[PDB]
């Protein structure tokens, strides 16, 4: 199951470490590609996430940055019509 918020984002807690195999643009504010860029997570780097979201065509993970701000990044596609996931863009440990 998933919790749901006022933007219709499906979300819950999950804690793991994600290492992308390609550069990924990270977002502030929320799990949408239209949100501002926080930075770039380079292939091979690792973030430790505490939240997972289904929104805007993707599964996103959320973490807290060094400035105390929330950061959001997409790790694979999510087709809401079928609840089908795409290939993971890296590895999770």
């Amino acid at each position: 199951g998933w919790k749901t918020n006022k933007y219709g984002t499906l979300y819950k807690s999950e804690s793991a470490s994600f290492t992308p195999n390609t550069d990924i643009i990270t977002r502030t504010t929320g799990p949408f590609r239209s949100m501002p860029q926080s930075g770039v997570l380079k292939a091979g780097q690792t973030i430790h996430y505490d939240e997972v979201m289904k929104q805007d065509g993707h599964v996103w993970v959320g973490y807290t940055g060094n400035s105390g701000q929330r950061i959001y990044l997409p790790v694979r596609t999510w087709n809401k019509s079928t609840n089908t996931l795409g290939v993971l863009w890296g590895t999770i440990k």
Partner: peptide, 5 residues
């Protein structure tokens, strides 16, 4: 939770 938008 789940951020904003």
């Amino acid at each position: 939770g789940g951020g904003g938008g």
